[PDB]
C-alpha cells in the first residue's frame, strides 16, 4: 500500500526511486565520502507459492521397522517415506542413538589427584603401628581441649558440661596461628586411623563417609585412647575404608608381606594417575559402519530392492567427511551435534622449545633477618611441566617401573601405563635446552594422546566425568552419494549397520585397550529424524518433476577421491616396493601417501577385529597423520622402464626425493632438511605457489589438513663426539645434575648432595665444546601429495596430463618404490591413488532411485 | 536506541578491537571463569630447599 | 592523596603519514594536488621545522 | 561541552549539484534502528 511505498518499507529501491543522476554521484564516489549508507531499499520475502499451507511436519520422526543385533553390531532399517508432494534433502537426516556407555575403570577424566590433593605428597595419615605399639607417644593432633575426663574424653560445655561425639578434624583448630596458642596446658587431641586399615599415604585417600556428619566409621562404630603419669591428650581412632581413586604408590618400601600394617616402612609415597579422557569419536567415527563389504547399507525404493550404495572397501569414506569438513568449515570450532571437535595436540608439547625458565630473582620463604627458604618457582613449574605433559608420554621403554610393585601383563592395559613412570633426569629442562628440537624418542610416536590436547577434551567432558554415562547423540549421514542427496516423493528403505565395540567407537588418550577394561552397551534406541521443508506443494510438484526427468539428475563426487591401499612394512625395514598390473590411467590425478603404525588400523572387514586393541586417534580414520618425517625417497616407474616425474622435470631426475639427510652437496631447502625440489612439488601442489615466487601461503588456502600449516622446521646442536676430546657419553642413569635438590633416577623425593654436574656439554658459552647439528621436519596432520599433472601445479580437477592419450589410450604397468627410515614396532604404509569417484542418481518412476558409480583409475 | 547501536555496531564491525575514542570495550567474561573446566592440576613433585618441605606449587 | 593525571600515547612500528592531497585523504596515486604541478615546469622549496 | 564535526572539503561546483538533488523529495534519506523494535518489558513475581 502507498503509505508503505512512500516510507520505502517495501517497493522501490534506493537504486530505482533515486533520480538516476544521484545514484551516480554515489557510485562515482564511494571510496571517499560514501553515502550509499544514507539511503534505503526494502527487502521483502516471497508473497506465496513457497509455503505449505496445510499440516506438513517439520522434523518428521521415523523409528525402525526392522531391527537386528549381533554381539558386535547393530542393524536397523527405516521405511523413510518422503511422501507425495514434497522434497527431502538427506543433509539434514541424522540418526539419533541413546544408550548407556560405561566408560571403563580407566577414565580418569581429571588429571592430577582429587582427594586431599594439596598434600605434602608423600606422607602418612596418622596411623598406628604394629607388633603391640602401646610403648611410645607420637604427638600430632588438633582440637585444643580442657580436661578429658575420659570414659567420655575431650569436652566442650553448656551451663553443665559436655564430653564429645564421633571429634571432628575436618579441620579443627590452632586458629591463632602466629601464637599457635600452644598445648593449652591441658588435654587436646585429634583422630587416628589405627591398624587394620590399609596404611596408604595421606593423599588420594577417600572414605565413603558413614556418619552423615561426614565421620568416617567402620559400620560397626569404633574409637578411644591414652593409658589411665596421667591423662595428657587423647586420640579417637578407627578402621575406615581408605582407597584412592587416583594414585600409584611409587616407593612402597618393600615389606611385601605385612601390608595393612606399617612399622615406618609402611609410610611410602604416591602420585596422581595419568589421565585418559575416554570419550566418544569426533565425527562420530565408527558409530556407523562405513566402507566394509559385510555390514554395509541401503537406501532403495520399497519397490525394487535396488540399493544405492555400493561401498567398495577402499574408499576411506570417513576420512572424507573429515576432510570435507576442512574445506567447507574450520575445525577449530567445536559444534556438538555431529560431535565435531577435531583433534590436535598443543604445539608446545610436540615441538617443545626449551625457551628456558625465567625466574631471574629469588623466589624466597617467610614463616608465619627473617628465616626462610626458596623454591625455583617458574622453574619447578617447568620440571612439573616437562615430566608431565611430554616425557611420561614417551615411548614405552625409556620408562622405568618402580620397585616392589608389579604391573599386569598384556601391555597397553591401563594398569600398565600408570604403573611405570618416566625419569625427571632426562627429557626435562636438562635436554636440548634453548632449542626447538622436538624430543627424538617420541619423534615417531602418536603425539595425540596428550591430556593437553583440545578436541579430545571437549567430548570427554561433553559427556561428563563419570564411568557411567547415558548418552544422547546424533550421527550425520556420512556417505558421499547420500549425504547431500535430494529425494523425490515415495517410500524408501534406509538401512545401516552400527558398531558397538568400544575399542572402535570411543577414542581414549593413552590407548589402553578399552576393549579389555570396559565399555558401551546399548543402543537402547535408534530412530532417524529428518527435517523436511514446508515447501508449498504446487511448487514442489514442479521441483519434483523436474528433478525426475533425466537430463537434470543429481550427481555427488566424494571429496577425497581415493583408491587407498595398505602396504605392510616389516618390523625394521625400508624400501617398500609396489607393482600394479597393466591398466588404464584415464583420469588419474596424482598420488597421496603416508605411513601408519599397524596397531592403529582395523582390518576394515568383519567388524570386530580382535588384533585391533589400540584406541588413540586412529590415523587411518581420524585424519591425523604423524609420520611424514620418516620418508626418504620415492621412485615411480612406468612399464618398468620410464620414471614418471621424469623428462628431467625435477632435480635428481628419477627419485622425487623428500628428505635428504647428511648428503647435502647443497640441496636441503629451508633451514631444515627437506629438499628444495620437494617443497616445490609439495607447495606447488597444494597452494599452487612455487614457480613464480615462493610466498607464505595465503590463508584461505592453508586449511589445517594442508602443508604450510605444518612443516615446522626444527634444529639443534650436540657434542660432535669425534671432535671435542671428551665426549664421555655419560648414560642417563649417571648424569648428576640438580645434584639432588630434585629426584633420584625416578619421580621420587629429594635425595641430593650438591655438585656442579654433567648436564649437557655446555654448547652456548665461553668454553662450549664444539658441535654438529641435525634438522627434522615434522609435517604431521597432512599427507604428501604427488599430482599427476605434467607440471606439478594444479589447473583443474582433472590434471593436464590425465587425459593425455598414452595414459588413457592403452594399458600400462606401474612400478614404484618408497623408502622410509627404520622404525621398530612394525608399521604399515598407506597410499592414495586419487581418482574421480563421481556418482549420478536418476529416478523416473516416482519411488525408485537408480544410482550409477564410477572410479576411472581402479574401477574394481 | 541504547542497545541497538551495540547491536548495530556488531555487523558492520568486530567489536573485539578496542577503539578508545568511543570507549569501545565489549563486556566479556573469561570462559575459564564462567564455564568452569576443572581438569585438575599437573603435579609430580614441586620441592623445597634451604638457603626441606613441599608445596604442590601447581595446586 | 591528590591526582594530576599524566597521559601519553605510545605508537610503535607505524610511520606518521601527512598524506599530500587535499581532503588529506587517499583517492589514488598521483594525488590531486600533485597532479597540478605536473606539466608546468615549475619549481618550489619546502622548509618544514 | 563542545560540539565537533567534520566537513568533507567537497567541490563547491559539486556540492551544489549534490544539493539541488538531495533536496528534491524524490531523493530523501531514510534510516532505521538495527534492533528495530519495541520493548515491552513485563515483571516476574519473585519466586514464580
Amino acid at each position: 500500500m502507498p503509505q508503505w511505498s512512500y516510507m520505502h518499507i517495501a517497493g522501490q529501491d534506493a537504486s530505482e526511486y533515486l533520480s538516476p543522476g544521484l545514484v551516480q554521484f554515489a557510485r562515482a564516489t564511494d571510496t571517499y565520502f560514501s553515502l550509499g549508507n544514507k539511503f534505503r531499499n526494502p527487502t521483502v520475502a516471497p508473497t506465496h507459492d513457497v509455503t505449505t499451507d496445510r499440516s506438513q511436519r517439520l522434523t518428521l520422526r521415523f523409528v525402525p521397522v526392522d531391527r537386528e543385533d549381533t554381539a558386535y553390531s547393530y542393524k536397523v532399517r527405516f521405511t523413510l517415506a518422503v511422501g507425495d508432494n514434497r522434497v527431502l534433502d538427506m543433509a539434514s537426516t541424522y540418526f539419533d542413538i541413546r544408550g548407556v556407555l560405561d566408560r571403563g575403570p580407566s577414565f580418569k577424566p581429571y588429571s592430577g589427584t582429587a582427594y586431599n590433593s594439596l598434600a605434602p605428597k608423600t606422607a602418612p595419615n596418622p596411623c598406628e603401628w604394629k607388633d603391640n605399639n602401646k610403648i611410645k607417644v607420637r604427638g600430632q593432633a588438633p582440637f585444643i581441649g580442657t580436661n578429658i575426663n575420659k570414659d567420655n574424653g575431650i569436652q566442650i560445655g553448656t551451663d553443665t558440661t559436655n564430653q564429645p561425639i564421633y571429634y571432628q578434624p575436618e579441620p579443627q583448630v590452632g586458629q591463632t596461628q602466629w601464637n599457635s596458642e600452644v598445648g593449652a596446658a591441658q588435654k587436646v587431641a585429634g583422630r587416628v586411623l589405627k591398624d587394620t586399615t590399609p596404611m596408604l599415604p595421606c593423599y588420594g585417600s577417600y572414605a565413603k563417609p558413614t556418619n552423615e556428619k561426614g565421620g568416617q566409621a567402620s559400620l560397626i562404630t569404633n574409637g578411644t585412647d591414652q593409658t589411665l603419669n596421667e591423662p595428657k591428650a587423647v586420640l579417637y581412632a578407627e578402621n575406615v575404608s581408605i582407597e584412592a581413586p587416583d594414585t600409584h604408590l611409587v616407593y612402597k618400601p618393600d615389606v611385601a608381606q605385612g601390608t595393612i600394617s606399617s612399622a615406618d616402612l609402611l609410610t611410602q609415597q604416591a602420585a596422581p594417575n595419568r589421565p585418559n579422557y575416554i570419550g566418544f569419536r569426533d565425527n562420530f567415527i565408527g558409530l556407523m559402519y562405513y566402507n566394509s563389504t559385510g555390514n554395509m547399507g541401503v537406501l532403495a525404493g520399497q519397490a525394487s530392492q535396488l540399493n544405492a550404495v555400493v561401498d567398495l572397501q577402499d574408499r576411506n569414506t570417513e576420512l572424507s567427511y573429515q576432510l570435507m569438513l576442512d574445506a567447507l568449515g574450520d575445525r577449530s570450532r567445536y559444534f556438538s551435534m555431529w560431535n565435531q571437535a577435531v583433534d590436535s595436540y598443543d604445539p608446545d608439547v610436540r615441538i617443545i622449545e626449551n625457551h628456558g625458565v625465567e625466574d631471574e630473582l629469588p623466589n624466597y620463604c617467610f614463616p608465619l633477618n627473617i628465616f626462610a627458604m626458596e623454591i625455583n618457582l617458574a622453574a619447578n613449574l617447568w620440571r612439573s611441566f616437562l615430566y608431565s605433559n611430554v616425557a611420561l608420554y614417551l615411548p614405552d621403554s625409556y620408562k622405568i617401573t618402580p620397585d616392589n610393585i608389579t604391573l599386569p601383563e598384556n601391555k597397553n592395559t591401563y594398569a600398565y601405563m600408570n604403573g611405570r613412570v618416566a625419569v625427571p633426569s632426562a627429557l626435562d629442562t636438562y635436554v636440548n635446552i634453548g632449542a626447538r628440537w622436538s624430543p627424538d624418542p617420541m619423534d615417531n610416536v602418536n603425539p595425540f594422546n596428550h591430556h593437553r590436547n583440545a578436541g579430545l577434551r571437549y567430548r570427554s567432558m561433553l559427556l561428563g566425568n563419570g564411568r557411567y554415562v547415558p548418552f544422547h547423540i546424533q550421527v550425520p549421514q556420512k556417505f558421499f552419494a547420500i549425504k547431500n542427496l535430494l529425494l523425490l516423493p515415495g517410500s524408501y528403505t534406509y538401512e545401516w549397520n552400527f558398531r558397538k565395540d568400544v575399542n572402535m567407537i570411543l577414542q581414549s588418550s593413552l590407548g589402553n585397550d578399552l576393549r579389555v577394561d570396559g565399555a558401551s552397551v546399548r543402543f537402547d534406541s535408534i530412530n532417524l529424524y529428518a527435517n523436511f521443508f514446508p515447501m508449498a506443494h504446487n511448487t514442489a510438484s514442479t521441483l519434483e518433476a523436474m528433478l525426475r526427468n533425466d537430463t537434470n539428475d543429481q550427481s555427488f563426487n566424494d571429496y577425497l577421491c581415493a583408491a587407498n591401499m595398505l602396504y605392510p612394512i616389516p618390523s625394521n625395514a625400508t624400501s617398500v616396493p609396489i607393482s600394479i598390473p597393466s591398466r588404464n590411467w584415464a583420469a588419474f590425478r596424482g598420488w597421496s601417501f603416508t605411513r601408519l603404525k599397524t596397531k592403529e588400523t582395523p582390518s576394515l572387514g568383519s567388524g570386530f577385529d580382535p588384533y585391533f586393541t589400540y584406541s588413540g586417534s586412529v590415523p587411518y580414520l581420524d585424519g591425523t597423520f604423524y609420520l611424514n618425517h620418516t620418508f626418504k625417497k620415492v621412485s615411480i616407474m612406468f612399464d618398468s622402464s620410464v620414471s614418471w616425474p621424469g623428462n628431467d622435470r625435477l632435480l635428481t631426475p628419477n627419485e622425487f626425493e623428500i628428505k635428504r639427510t647428511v648428503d647435502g652437496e647443497g640441496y636441503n631447502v629451508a633451514q631444515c632438511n627437506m629438499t628444495k625440489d620437494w617443497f616445490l612439488i609439495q607447495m606447488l601442489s597444494h597452494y599452487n605457489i612455487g614457480y613464480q615466487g615462493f610466498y607464505v601461503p595465503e590463508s584461505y588456502k592453508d586449511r589445517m589438513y594442508s602443508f604450510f600449516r605444518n612443516f615446522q622446521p626444527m634444529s639443534r646442536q650436540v657434542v660432535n663426539t669425534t671432535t671435542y676430546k671428551e665426549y664421555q657419553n655419560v648414560t642417563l642413569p649417571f648424569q648428576h645434575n640438580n645434584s639432588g635438590f630434585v629426584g633420584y633416577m625416578g619421580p621420587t623425593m629429594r635425595e641430593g648432595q650438591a655438585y656442579p654436574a654433567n648436564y649437557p656439554y655446555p654448547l652456548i658459552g665461553q668454553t662450549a665444546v664444539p658441535s654438529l647439528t641435525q634438522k627434522k621436519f615434522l609435517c604431521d596432520r597432512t599427507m604428501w601429495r604427488i599430482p599427476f599433472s605434467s607440471n606439478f601445479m594444479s589447473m583443474g580437477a582433472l590434471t593436464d596430463l590425465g587425459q593425455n592419450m598414452l595414459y588413457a589410450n592403452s594399458a600400462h604397468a606401474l612400478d614404484m618404490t618408497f623408502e622410509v627410515d627404520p622404525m621398530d614396532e612394525p608399521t604399515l604404509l598407506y597410499v592414495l591413488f586419487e581418482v574421480f569417484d563421481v556418482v549420478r542418481i536418476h529416478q523416473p518412476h516416482r519411488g525408485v532411485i537408480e544410482a550409477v558409480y564410477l572410479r576411472t583409475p581402479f574401477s574394481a | 536506541t541504547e542497545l541497538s547501536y551495540q547491536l548495530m555496531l556488531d555487523a558492520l564491525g568486530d567489536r573485539s578491537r578496542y577503539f578508545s575514542m568511543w570507549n569501545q570495550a565489549v563486556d566479556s567474561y573469561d570462559p575459564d571463569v564462567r564455564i568452569i573446566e576443572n581438569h585438575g592440576v599437573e603435579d609430580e613433585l614441586p620441592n623445597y630447599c634451604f638457603p626441606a618441605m613441599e608445596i604442590n606449587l601447581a595446586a | 592523596v591528590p591526582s594530576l593525571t599524566q597521559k601519553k600515547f605510545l605508537c610503535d612500528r607505524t610511520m606518521w603519514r601527512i598524506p599530500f592531497s587535499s581532503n588529506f585523504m587517499s583517492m589514488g596515486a598521483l594525488t590531486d594536488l600533485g597532479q597540478n604541478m605536473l606539466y608546468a615546469n615549475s619549481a618550489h622549496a619546502l622548509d618544514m621545522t | 561541552i563542545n560540539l565537533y564535526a567534520n566537513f568533507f572539503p567537497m567541490a563547491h561546483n559539486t556540492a551544489s549539484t549534490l544539493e539541488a538533488m538531495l533536496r528534491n523529495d524524490t531523493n530523501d534519506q531514510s534510516f532505521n534502528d538495527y534492533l528495530c523494535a519495541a520493548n515491552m518489558l513485563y515483571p516476574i513475581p519473585s519466586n514464580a
Binding site: 529501491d13 534506493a14 537504486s15 533515486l18 545514484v23 551516480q24 554515489a26 557510485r27 562515482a28 564516489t29 564511494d30 571510496t31 560514501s34 553515502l35 550509499g36 549508507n37 544514507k38 539511503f39 534505503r40 531499499n41 526494502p42 527487502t43 | 547491536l7 548495530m8 556488531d10 555487523a11 | 603519514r17 587517499s26 583517492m27 589514488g28 596515486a29 | 532505521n32 538495527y34 534492533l35 528495530c36
Partner: peptide, 26 residues
C-alpha cells in the same frame, strides 16, 4: 537486526586509467 542499505548499481573507478587504494605503494 535489519540492514537493507542502498547504493548498488555497481561502482565507477572509471577507466582511461584505473582503481584507487593503490594496489602497492605506501
Amino acid at each position: 537486526p535489519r540492514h537493507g542499505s542502498r547504493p548498488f548499481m555497481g561502482t565507477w573507478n572509471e577507466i582511461g586509467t584505473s582503481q584507487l587504494n593503490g594496489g602497492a605503494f605506501s
